[PDB]
Every structure is written in C-alpha cells, then in structure tokens.
Amino acid sequence: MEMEKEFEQIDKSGSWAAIYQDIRHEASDFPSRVAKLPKNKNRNRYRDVSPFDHSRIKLHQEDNDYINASLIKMEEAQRSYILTQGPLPNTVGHFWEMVWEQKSRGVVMLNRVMEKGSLKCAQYWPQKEEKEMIFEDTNLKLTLISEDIKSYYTVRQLELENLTTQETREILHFHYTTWPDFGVPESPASFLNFLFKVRESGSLSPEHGPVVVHCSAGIGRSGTFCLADTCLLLMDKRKDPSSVDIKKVLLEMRKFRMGLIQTADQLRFSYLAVIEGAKF
C-alpha cells in the first residue's frame, strides 16, 4: 500500500499513537545479560536502554569488552550501522577505541552536548586545533584538523592516532545541530540534506567499517536516521518501490537494538522523510 496513502489515512484518522503501540507490542525481546552485570553499571547512561547480547559491539581487550553499542545489519539493503549512546565521562576512551577497531570513516551526532539545561553527552572531541585530546586508558590521540559550520549542521575533519602503532586515520564528524529540544522538526528538508551530505562523504559505503550513529540514548533520533536511509535505498533497488513497508523495516531493525523510534511523532516524521525523499 503506497506509504503516502497509508500516511494520509493515519493522519485523517489520527491513529499515530495506535500504530506506534502495535510496533511496541510486536517488537523482538532478546537477552541483555552483559549490559546488566554490576561491573558495567557506570558504562550505561540509561537503566532501560541496553544492547542485546547477540548484536552488541565487543571492545578488543581482555579486561572488560563492554560498550553500550549495537550492530544493525540490513541484509537486503546491504548497509550496516553501529548505534550507540552519547559517551559518558568514563566511556569517551571506549568510544574512540570502538571507532578505531571497527574501521569506521564517519561519526554521526544528532544531539547537542547540553539540551533542556542538562548534559546529554560528554564533550568527546577537541574544539581547538592546538588543544588535542589524549585518552590514556585506550592509548589514542585525537586532533581537530578543520571545521565547516553551516546553518543546520557542522562537519569536522579529525585525526585519530593509535599511539601504540603510530598509525593515523581521518574521521569525519557529521553534527546535526538544530533538532529541537521538544518534538521533531516541522519539515524534514534539512534532515534529508544532512543524510545526503553524509552519503556523499563515503562514510556509509562498503569500503569502510560501519558508520557510528548516536544521540543521547542511541534509539530515537538515531533510529530515525538509519530507518530513513535504509527505506530510500530499498526504493532505489527494488522493481516495485511501493512494496517498501516502513513498519516492517523498523521491526527488522528492532531485532538488533531495542526501542528504535521513541515516540509516535518520531514515527510520523520517519514517514514524512521517506515520502519527500522519494520524489528525487
């Protein structure tokens, strides 16, 4: 059923809340035993948001391999994403260790460091060229190379150095800076412009490791980003683009991380983004 028609049908009936709760009811439930170990309590931002054991990213160390991060693997679209929480003061070193170990080219950030007057994630990247960051727990150095500030987003070039081997890589930081404190954007134009700026970079392409995507919990805005990308890619690939069922793609993705798309407004926004995106 053409998504645009289903859309007008839910909008006129005002049943967004009812569709959203049907998804919550049918969503996968798998064990998260590693996330709930007592040694990992300070590695989790939110008590109710955990990675499933079957899909969690493992850090390459014998001490403690745990990070709040999941691999979403979309078989038919041929795309992979790592979804993670905003780093904590004690997990900034783990975060960059993961970026290094997984061979990621890009980091996508969908939140501000402070929102609603509270801290949503650590200041985990350097703000001045001449003031680099060293993560002594994971033996990494991070340097700001350049910064391009636009109206709706900022792109940064970063240099990550493995202090153990003296190898370096260029990491691109895509920072969407204008998502509102409450609700969702009124038009997805600027969100869609961001998704194609990331795409053009090569960060989402199979010659690199998976892109790392985060907001505060790594399920809401982060969910919206990977659902819209995968849905448009499937509309490109298939003989009948109307066959793309946004609700079925979301339930497939929820086999890999719990809670993706946090509100009925985020679900309506996801629909808006894929409808306007299609035209081009």
Ligand SMILES: Cc1nc(-c2ccncc2)sc1CN
């Ligand atoms: C290649 C492609 N580029 C699109 C685009 C470009 C600029 N701004 C928004 C969207 S849609 C599309 C279909 N694969």
